[PDB]
Design a binder for this molecule. Sequence first.
Ligand SMILES: NC(=O)c1ccc[n+]([C@@H]2O[C@H](COP(=O)([O-])OP(=O)(O)OC[C@H]3O[C@@H](n4cnc5c(N)ncnc54)[C@H](O)[C@@H]3O)[C@@H](O)[C@H]2O)c1
Ligand SMILES: NC(=O)c1ccc[n+]([C@@H]2O[C@H](COP(=O)([O-])OP(=O)(O)OC[C@H]3O[C@@H](n4cnc5c(N)ncnc54)[C@H](O)[C@@H]3O)[C@@H](O)[C@H]2O)c1
Ligand SMILES: [Cl-]
Ligand SMILES: [Cl-]
Ligand SMILES: [Cl-]
Ligand SMILES: [Cl-]
Ligand SMILES: [Mg+2]
Ligand SMILES: [Mg+2]
Lengths: 337, 337, 294, 294
Amino acid sequence: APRVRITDSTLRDGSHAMAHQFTEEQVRATVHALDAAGVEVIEVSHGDGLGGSSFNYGFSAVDEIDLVAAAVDEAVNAKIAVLLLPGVGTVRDLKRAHDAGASVARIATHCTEADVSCQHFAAARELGMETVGFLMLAHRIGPEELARQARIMVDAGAQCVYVVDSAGALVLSDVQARVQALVREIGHEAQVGFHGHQNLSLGVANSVLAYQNGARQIDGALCALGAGAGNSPTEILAATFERLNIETGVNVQAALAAAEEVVRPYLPRLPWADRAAIVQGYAGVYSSFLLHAERAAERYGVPAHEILQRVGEAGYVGGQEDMIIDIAVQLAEERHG
Amino acid sequence: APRVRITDSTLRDGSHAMAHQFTEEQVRATVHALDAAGVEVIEVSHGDGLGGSSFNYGFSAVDEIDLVAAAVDEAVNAKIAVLLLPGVGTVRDLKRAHDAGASVARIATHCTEADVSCQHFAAARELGMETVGFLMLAHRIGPEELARQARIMVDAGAQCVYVVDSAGALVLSDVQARVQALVREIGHEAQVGFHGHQNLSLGVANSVLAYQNGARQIDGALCALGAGAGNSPTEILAATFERLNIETGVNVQAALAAAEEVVRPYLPRLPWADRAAIVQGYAGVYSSFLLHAERAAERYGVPAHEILQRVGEAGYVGGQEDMIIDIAVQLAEERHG
Amino acid sequence: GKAVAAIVGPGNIGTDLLIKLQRSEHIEVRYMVGVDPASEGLARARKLGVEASAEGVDWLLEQDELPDLVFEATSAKAHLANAPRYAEAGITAIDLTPAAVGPLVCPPVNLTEHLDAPNVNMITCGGQATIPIVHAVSRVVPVAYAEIVAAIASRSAGPGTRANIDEFTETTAAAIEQVGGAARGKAIIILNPVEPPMIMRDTVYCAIPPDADTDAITASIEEMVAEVARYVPGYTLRTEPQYDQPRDIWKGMARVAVFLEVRGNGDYLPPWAGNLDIMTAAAARVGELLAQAP
Amino acid sequence: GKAVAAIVGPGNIGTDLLIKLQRSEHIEVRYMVGVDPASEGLARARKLGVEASAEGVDWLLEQDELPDLVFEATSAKAHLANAPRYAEAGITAIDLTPAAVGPLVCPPVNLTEHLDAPNVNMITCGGQATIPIVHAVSRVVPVAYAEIVAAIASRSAGPGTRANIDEFTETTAAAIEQVGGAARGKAIIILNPVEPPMIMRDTVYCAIPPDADTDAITASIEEMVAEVARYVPGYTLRTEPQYDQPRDIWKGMARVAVFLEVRGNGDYLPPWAGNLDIMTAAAARVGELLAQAP
Ligand SMILES: NC(=O)c1ccc[n+]([C@@H]2O[C@H](COP(=O)([O-])OP(=O)(O)OC[C@H]3O[C@@H](n4cnc5c(N)ncnc54)[C@H](O)[C@@H]3O)[C@@H](O)[C@H]2O)c1
Ligand SMILES: NC(=O)c1ccc[n+]([C@@H]2O[C@H](COP(=O)([O-])OP(=O)(O)OC[C@H]3O[C@@H](n4cnc5c(N)ncnc54)[C@H](O)[C@@H]3O)[C@@H](O)[C@H]2O)c1
Ligand SMILES: [Cl-]
Ligand SMILES: [Cl-]
Ligand SMILES: [Cl-]
Ligand SMILES: [Cl-]
Ligand SMILES: [Mg+2]
Ligand SMILES: [Mg+2]
């Protein structure tokens, strides 16, 4: 049975849950524990990718490039990956991350907008980096439309394209259908990946189904650390694939110790499918909106889950955090009457 | 598409997580919120079923029969269910619960021991109660062996038999195979159920797969409240089945409010797949051993996950909590050297 | 010289008992009596020269030479039906089922108490393993509550055991109180099909005063374990008794927990089936004394 | 009387510009110039009597009557190639791409500053919508950092926009600093394919002193919005500017957040595509003044 490569995003998707407050020591400790556990790719950036530090998404406590450099210094076997979103991060940012030693570039677009990724894939390939394409909020369009966007990324230089369940809104066969379509379209020349969120508690199952339908790359995070209800937990992916006799190269005991002894102590709170996160999964709302919605809820005196329900109705995409404030102001007036 | 009936076990399986300290007010508030949400069956007993209050499993703060009576008084549409384990609870206990107004008897045996359930099924049918059979730790034997045990329960009077993933150790196709076998064996005359735990974060997916392979009864708990890493969350089952267009009769918004506003405030801690709970899922250890293992860990100064790993190696079944203490004493000596 | 005995119920307990009684000084097993011609116990009886029949208690009671003693190892409901038939025929009955028609006997505690009764009940395997421990504690300090957990290899519990699980519970609890000396009793039985098969385990929990002398309790427990082990050598303490401090939920009482393992001698089933021995050795002790009455 | 203009790039921006320039007092659009014979903008030019060609800038520069003005709405890389060709031929260039060969012009802020340049850059849609707000704040208080978020309906961003996303970012950021007056600038662009299509949104965040007069800032913002709305009537404030208290992560500065929606007039694409209008109305203002030079 073909092996699967897990990419860990504790230090990128997890940055959302940390409000981008990761210290160098936390990054070093986490990279060390992941690398020692056999994790092959470790993603390190601001939650919203390189150049993500902003008013819109939150500022980083420590420059992400310094964190990337610390990750590279710490890693013995693992590759360090970075995420970029065209429209947020730039080729100049990617070049800085490459100089710092990052060797995998993960370029993310909304699922219908792959053609904005061309500049970044070109630059990444010229640098000699491994490339991965991310099609965000992949529940929003059907399998064949998603495969067409995957082709655009492969033609641009992507060596893998992920189905990315940014809202944790996909349910089982939904993943099967999308992975099947991407495999048919690009499989002869690129890998297919899956990145799951836990908003309906389906990340791990969706990941197994992805692999069984031809995906060879799967994302997790230690302790589910990540946006919304969190990501598929790396330590559970390692345990489950081991039970299924699917090689990951990750030592289960070491992964359980990384989660329990290194990551859990610095968690602000446990990643949880509470009402607000489940509303995200149900309504298809980008997972990173959660803490921004909770902040606006306190700022304006309205419920976070009501903000998120409205965001659901409006159909916003990744990066539209600003719309949360407009909605919260409106809700404060409506609820006042 | 045929409807599925959700049974909620916040107030029975959840009793494990509460160390059986539920108050009457908590039961009344939770029953009210579940019933108002459309939940059709609400299970109320000690974690280890009627007569479970003991040194071995922990004493109840309030007599479970009083809690059953309060649940019955509070419910407007829901049936109140009780769990019994032959060898722990008795026919006399069942009769007390019937007098208190319970109308569904769920009789649980280890998956290979269905023939001990005959006395309890007979008594339940004579009382005119609906009957459900639970085959615990169902990962321990194969599909056809499990179906043979299901037949024994149906012949004894069970009207439904569950595949019960007591350890949260079953993985997707594992559930499909078992549900398929029970459906082939008993489906023409009894329903098939599934009860999932969250130790590998597969409870909800396993529940969907159960339904898609012919199960018509599925268990959850609000906020996953239950043994080990918890049960499939009722509020997520309601949301997911709604997304799949499978009628449950449960109002999603009302279920999310029950979890968030009624149950979450009284949680001792969030149900979590930490290292100890994942060791249970991986090694196949009965979920209710968790808090007893954590207590022994503190009592003897040894790690809870090491206790649970040893329990895994020994193959204990439900109800064997006493073995945790023997193992912890041994580990304290071994670790001392 | 020897008293003439019948064994009714040629199953796991009945067959282990047959073997043990053939070592007996004072009892001759003359009859093995069942209901299924394929019963392995009837085949073992025949090989050992014992008259064997699958024609039931009807057949036994038709025989020209009635036994002095009958040991019954069928199931609670079967003994309830048979007990008055033995009483009418004047045959002293030793009941190994949890039927409890007669008074409760745990030989390490009250062996001679009920020797004049026409029917004595031997409680259960769990009881015989644990009531000596309940007594070992309650003879030192008051025990407001005692609970026992008996875990048995599934292969050692036949259909007769499985049919009377409720009665196992209730009879053992009653004996914890009446024979063990606890004010309140509870009993749990668990069947485990693990391979290799499990050696019988029994845990005993006793509520004890918060100021109890735990060294005195332990000494009493150890003495009692040695007395039981004279008859069942595989009856052992797994660990030192474990003492726990008072808790509010425990009504301010402390606890002692005693962990036993019971290996058998392998007479019929292998040594993991110590649950058979702890009962049959107890029944043999009672039988040997009943056999010596005029 | 009127200055002779060419539009190079008959796409979304180029076609909206064509329509708007035909209302112009001082500019005659003589040439529409593209590279794809199927371009809808070339068909619209022909219907409106404008000479249209898919033979590119080569064709334009061969014409007997060269235009006085060229507006380019192709893509950054295309303008980088074409700009020196316009310069050599003596044709004043208005660049609607983020190429930024020429100095940066935001008409509500610095309309007359660069009127003598042979090439002026109009920044981006995001810039034209938000730099007036950055200026409205920075004219009242120092702004150490300003960030803009432009969200556009995917249907309104053609291939030319999609090919220069990096340049959109960098040019808008540079203009936030040089024209808007912030010490540091950042720009984000998001494409949303939602149906019904989204009306362009722009958010502006400015770091402001913790003791700022927020009533004065709001008054300045409102005045500037009214000045922009004279030219783009669908340019509106969604809410009152939102002020937030200082945070440590914000280096002790407070924040103002300004939420704009930009409806267009529906000249080419529907009114949701206000991103076209905010740019083309700006280019038309510059063009009208350049047209009146001797
Ligand atoms: N298994 C144990 O460790 C254990 C220990 C102590 C006591 N017991 C008690 O001993 C009894 C027998 O248990 P077991 O595990 O040996 O069961 P079993 O099923 O192995 O043996 C019962 C035997 O009785 C025979 N039988 C049934 N009804 C009869 C009748 N009316 N007349 C004559 N024979 C009849 C059966 O055919 C079988 O041979 C039960 O009451 C049980 O609770 C069992
Ligand atoms: N879409 C917006 O809202 C918006 C707003 C302001 C600025 N812009 C900028 O305007 C430019 C065009 O954007 P768009 O959305 O209209 O793109 P578009 O793809 O719709 O239009 C580009 C047009 O230029 C033509 N073209 C391409 N290369 C050419 C060349 N070398 N010579 C002549 N014609 C050529 C194309 O065939 C097409 O007709 C981009 O630089 C973009 O960043 C866009
Ligand atoms: Cl599905
Ligand atoms: Cl599977
Ligand atoms: Cl002990
Ligand atoms: Cl505003
Ligand atoms: Mg993510
Ligand atoms: Mg359970």
